[PDB]
CSV table of all heavy atoms in Angstrom, one decimal:
chain,number,residue,atom,x,y,z
H,30,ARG,N,89.1,108.3,69.8
H,30,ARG,CA,90.6,108.1,69.8
H,30,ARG,C,91.0,108.0,71.2
H,30,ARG,O,90.7,108.9,72.0
H,30,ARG,CB,91.3,109.2,69.0
H,30,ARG,CG,91.0,109.3,67.6
H,30,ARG,CD,91.5,108.1,66.8
H,30,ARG,NE,91.3,108.2,65.4
H,30,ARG,CZ,92.1,108.8,64.5
H,30,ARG,NH1,93.3,109.3,64.9
H,30,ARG,NH2,91.8,108.8,63.2
H,39,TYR,N,107.7,100.9,71.7
H,39,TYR,CA,108.2,99.9,70.7
H,39,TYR,C,109.5,100.4,70.1
H,39,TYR,O,110.4,99.6,69.9
H,39,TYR,CB,107.1,99.7,69.7
H,39,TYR,CG,107.6,98.8,68.6
H,39,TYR,CD1,107.9,97.5,68.8
H,39,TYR,CD2,107.7,99.3,67.3
H,39,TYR,CE1,108.3,96.7,67.7
H,39,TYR,CE2,108.1,98.5,66.2
H,39,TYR,CZ,108.4,97.2,66.5
H,39,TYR,OH,108.9,96.4,65.4
H,50,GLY,N,110.8,91.2,70.7
H,50,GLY,CA,109.5,91.8,70.4
H,50,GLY,C,108.7,92.1,71.7
H,50,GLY,O,109.4,92.3,72.8
H,51,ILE,N,107.4,92.2,71.6
H,51,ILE,CA,106.6,92.5,72.8
H,51,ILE,C,105.2,92.0,72.6
H,51,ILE,O,104.8,91.7,71.4
H,51,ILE,CB,106.6,94.1,73.1
H,51,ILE,CG1,106.3,94.4,74.6
H,51,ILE,CG2,105.6,94.8,72.2
H,51,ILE,CD1,106.9,95.7,75.1
H,52,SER,N,104.4,91.8,73.6
H,52,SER,CA,103.1,91.3,73.6
H,52,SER,C,102.1,92.4,73.9
H,52,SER,O,102.5,93.5,74.3
H,52,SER,CB,102.9,90.0,74.5
H,52,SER,OG,102.8,90.4,75.8
H,53,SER,N,100.8,92.0,73.8
H,53,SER,CA,99.8,93.0,74.2
H,53,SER,C,99.7,93.2,75.7
H,53,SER,O,99.6,94.3,76.2
H,53,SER,CB,98.4,92.5,73.7
H,53,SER,OG,98.5,92.0,72.4
H,82,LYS,N,104.7,128.7,96.5
H,82,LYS,CA,103.8,129.7,95.8
H,82,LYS,C,104.3,129.9,94.3
H,82,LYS,O,104.3,131.0,93.8
H,82,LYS,CB,103.7,131.0,96.5
H,82,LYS,CG,103.5,130.9,98.0
H,82,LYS,CD,102.1,130.3,98.3
H,82,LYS,CE,102.2,129.1,99.2
H,82,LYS,NZ,101.0,128.2,99.1
H,83,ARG,N,104.7,128.8,93.7
H,83,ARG,CA,105.2,128.9,92.3
H,83,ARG,C,104.0,128.6,91.4
H,83,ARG,O,103.3,127.6,91.5
H,83,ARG,CB,106.3,127.8,92.1
H,83,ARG,CG,107.6,128.4,91.7
H,83,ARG,CD,108.1,129.3,92.7
H,83,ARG,NE,109.2,130.2,92.2
H,83,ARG,CZ,110.5,129.9,92.1
H,83,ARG,NH1,110.9,128.6,92.4
H,83,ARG,NH2,111.3,130.7,91.6
H,84,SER,N,103.8,129.6,90.4
H,84,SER,CA,102.7,129.5,89.5
H,84,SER,C,103.1,128.7,88.2
H,84,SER,O,102.2,128.5,87.3
H,84,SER,CB,102.2,130.9,89.1
H,84,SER,OG,101.5,131.5,90.2
N,34,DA,P,94.5,86.5,69.5
N,34,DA,OP1,94.0,86.1,70.8
N,34,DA,OP2,93.5,86.6,68.4
N,34,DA,O5',95.3,87.8,69.6
N,34,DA,C5',96.2,88.1,70.7
N,34,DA,C4',97.6,88.1,70.2
N,34,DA,O4',97.7,87.3,69.0
N,34,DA,C3',98.2,89.4,69.9
N,34,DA,O3',99.6,89.4,69.9
N,34,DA,C2',97.7,89.5,68.4
N,34,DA,C1',98.1,88.2,67.9
N,34,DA,N9,97.5,87.7,66.7
N,34,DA,C8,96.2,87.5,66.5
N,34,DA,N7,95.9,87.0,65.3
N,34,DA,C5,97.1,86.9,64.7
N,34,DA,C6,97.6,86.5,63.4
N,34,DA,N6,96.7,86.0,62.5
N,34,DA,N1,98.9,86.5,63.1
N,34,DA,C2,99.7,86.9,64.1
N,34,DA,N3,99.5,87.3,65.3
N,34,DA,C4,98.1,87.3,65.6
N,35,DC,P,100.5,90.7,70.1
N,35,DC,OP1,100.5,91.1,71.5
N,35,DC,OP2,100.1,91.7,69.1
N,35,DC,O5',102.0,90.2,69.7
N,35,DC,C5',102.2,89.5,68.5
N,35,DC,C4',103.4,90.1,67.8
N,35,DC,O4',103.2,90.0,66.4
N,35,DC,C3',103.6,91.6,68.0
N,35,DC,O3',104.9,91.9,67.7
N,35,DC,C2',102.6,92.2,67.0
N,35,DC,C1',102.7,91.2,65.8
N,35,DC,N1,101.4,90.9,65.2
N,35,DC,C2,101.3,90.4,63.9
N,35,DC,O2,102.4,90.3,63.2
N,35,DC,N3,100.1,90.1,63.3
N,35,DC,C4,99.0,90.2,64.1
N,35,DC,N4,97.8,89.9,63.5
N,35,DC,C5,99.1,90.7,65.4
N,35,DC,C6,100.3,91.0,65.9
N,36,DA,P,105.5,93.4,68.0
N,36,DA,OP1,106.8,93.2,68.6
N,36,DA,OP2,104.5,94.2,68.7
N,36,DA,O5',105.7,94.0,66.6
N,36,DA,C5',106.5,93.3,65.6
N,36,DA,C4',106.1,93.7,64.2
N,36,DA,O4',104.7,93.3,64.0
N,36,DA,C3',106.2,95.2,63.8
N,36,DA,O3',106.8,95.3,62.5
N,36,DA,C2',104.8,95.6,63.9
N,36,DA,C1',104.1,94.4,63.3
N,36,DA,N9,102.6,94.4,63.7
N,36,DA,C8,102.1,94.7,64.9
N,36,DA,N7,100.8,94.5,64.9
N,36,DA,C5,100.5,94.1,63.6
N,36,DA,C6,99.2,93.7,63.0
N,36,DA,N6,98.1,93.8,63.6
N,36,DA,N1,99.3,93.3,61.7
N,36,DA,C2,100.5,93.2,61.1
N,36,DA,N3,101.7,93.6,61.6
N,36,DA,C4,101.6,94.0,62.9
N,37,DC,P,107.6,96.5,62.0
N,37,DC,OP1,109.0,96.2,62.2
N,37,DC,OP2,107.1,97.7,62.7
N,37,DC,O5',107.3,96.7,60.5
N,37,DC,C5',107.3,95.5,59.7
N,37,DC,C4',106.3,95.7,58.5
N,37,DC,O4',104.9,95.4,59.0
N,37,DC,C3',106.2,97.1,57.9
N,37,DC,O3',106.3,96.9,56.4
N,37,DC,C2',104.9,97.6,58.3
N,37,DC,C1',104.0,96.4,58.5
N,37,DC,N1,102.9,96.6,59.5
N,37,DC,C2,101.6,96.4,59.2
N,37,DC,O2,101.3,96.1,58.0
N,37,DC,N3,100.6,96.6,60.1
N,37,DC,C4,101.0,96.9,61.4
N,37,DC,N4,100.0,97.0,62.3
N,37,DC,C5,102.3,97.1,61.7
N,37,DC,C6,103.3,96.9,60.8
N,42,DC,P,89.1,110.6,57.7
N,42,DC,OP1,88.0,109.7,58.1
N,42,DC,OP2,88.9,111.6,56.6
N,42,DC,O5',89.6,111.4,59.0
N,42,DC,C5',90.2,110.7,60.1
N,42,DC,C4',91.0,111.6,61.0
N,42,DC,O4',92.4,111.7,60.4
N,42,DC,C3',90.5,113.0,61.1
N,42,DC,O3',90.5,113.4,62.4
N,42,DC,C2',91.4,113.8,60.2
N,42,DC,C1',92.7,113.0,60.3
N,42,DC,N1,93.6,113.2,59.1
N,42,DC,C2,94.9,112.6,59.1
N,42,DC,O2,95.3,112.1,60.2
N,42,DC,N3,95.7,112.8,58.0
N,42,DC,C4,95.2,113.4,57.0
N,42,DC,N4,96.1,113.5,55.9
N,42,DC,C5,93.9,114.0,56.9
N,42,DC,C6,93.2,113.8,58.0
N,43,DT,P,89.2,113.4,63.3
N,43,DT,OP1,88.5,112.2,63.1
N,43,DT,OP2,88.5,114.7,63.1
N,43,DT,O5',89.7,113.4,64.8
N,43,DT,C5',90.7,112.5,65.2
N,43,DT,C4',92.0,113.3,65.6
N,43,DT,O4',92.7,113.7,64.4
N,43,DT,C3',91.8,114.5,66.5
N,43,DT,O3',92.8,114.5,67.5
N,43,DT,C2',92.0,115.6,65.5
N,43,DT,C1',93.0,115.1,64.5
N,43,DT,N1,93.1,115.7,63.2
N,43,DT,C2,94.2,115.5,62.4
N,43,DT,O2,95.2,114.9,62.7
N,43,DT,N3,94.1,116.2,61.2
N,43,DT,C4,93.0,116.9,60.7
N,43,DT,O4,93.0,117.4,59.6
N,43,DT,C5,91.9,117.0,61.6
N,43,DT,C7,90.7,117.8,61.2
N,43,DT,C6,92.0,116.4,62.8
N,54,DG,P,100.6,136.4,87.5
N,54,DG,OP1,99.6,135.6,86.8
N,54,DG,OP2,100.1,137.4,88.5
N,54,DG,O5',101.7,135.5,88.2
N,54,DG,C5',102.2,134.4,87.4
N,54,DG,C4',103.8,134.3,87.5
N,54,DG,O4',104.3,135.4,86.7
N,54,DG,C3',104.4,134.4,88.9
N,54,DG,O3',105.5,133.6,88.9
N,54,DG,C2',104.7,135.9,89.0
N,54,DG,C1',105.2,136.2,87.6
N,54,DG,N9,105.1,137.6,87.1
N,54,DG,C8,104.3,138.5,87.6
N,54,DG,N7,104.4,139.7,87.0
N,54,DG,C5,105.5,139.5,86.1
N,54,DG,C6,106.1,140.3,85.2
N,54,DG,O6,105.8,141.5,84.9
N,54,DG,N1,107.1,139.7,84.4
N,54,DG,C2,107.5,138.4,84.6
N,54,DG,N2,108.5,137.9,83.8
N,54,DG,N3,106.9,137.5,85.4
N,54,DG,C4,105.9,138.2,86.2
N,55,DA,P,106.1,133.0,90.3
N,55,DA,OP1,105.6,131.6,90.4
N,55,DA,OP2,105.8,133.9,91.4
N,55,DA,O5',107.7,133.0,90.1
N,55,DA,C5',108.3,132.2,89.1
N,55,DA,C4',109.4,132.9,88.4
N,55,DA,O4',109.0,134.2,88.0
N,55,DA,C3',110.6,133.2,89.3
N,55,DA,O3',111.8,133.1,88.6
N,55,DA,C2',110.4,134.6,89.8
N,55,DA,C1',109.9,135.2,88.6
N,55,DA,N9,109.1,136.4,88.8
N,55,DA,C8,108.0,136.6,89.6
N,55,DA,N7,107.5,137.8,89.6
N,55,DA,C5,108.2,138.5,88.6
N,55,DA,C6,108.1,139.8,88.1
N,55,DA,N6,107.2,140.7,88.5
N,55,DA,N1,109.0,140.1,87.2
N,55,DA,C2,109.9,139.2,86.7
N,55,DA,N3,110.1,137.9,87.2
N,55,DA,C4,109.2,137.6,88.1
N,56,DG,P,113.2,132.4,89.2
N,56,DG,OP1,113.1,131.0,89.1
N,56,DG,OP2,113.4,133.1,90.5
N,56,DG,O5',114.3,132.9,88.2
N,56,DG,C5',114.0,133.9,87.2
N,56,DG,C4',115.3,134.7,86.8
N,56,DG,O4',114.9,136.1,86.7
N,56,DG,C3',116.4,134.7,87.8
N,56,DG,O3',117.6,135.0,87.2
N,56,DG,C2',116.0,135.7,88.8
N,56,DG,C1',115.3,136.8,87.9
N,56,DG,N9,114.1,137.3,88.5
N,56,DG,C8,113.1,136.7,89.3
N,56,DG,N7,112.2,137.4,89.7
N,56,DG,C5,112.5,138.7,89.2
N,56,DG,C6,111.8,139.9,89.4
N,56,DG,O6,110.8,140.1,90.0
N,56,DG,N1,112.5,141.0,88.8
N,56,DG,C2,113.7,140.8,88.1
N,56,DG,N2,114.2,142.0,87.5
N,56,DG,N3,114.3,139.7,87.9
N,56,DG,C4,113.7,138.7,88.5
Side-chain angles (χ1 to χ4, degrees):
Chain H
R30 298 290 183 92
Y39 174 67
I51 206 152
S52 76
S53 317
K82 316 290 123 202
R83 242 57 199 280
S84 289

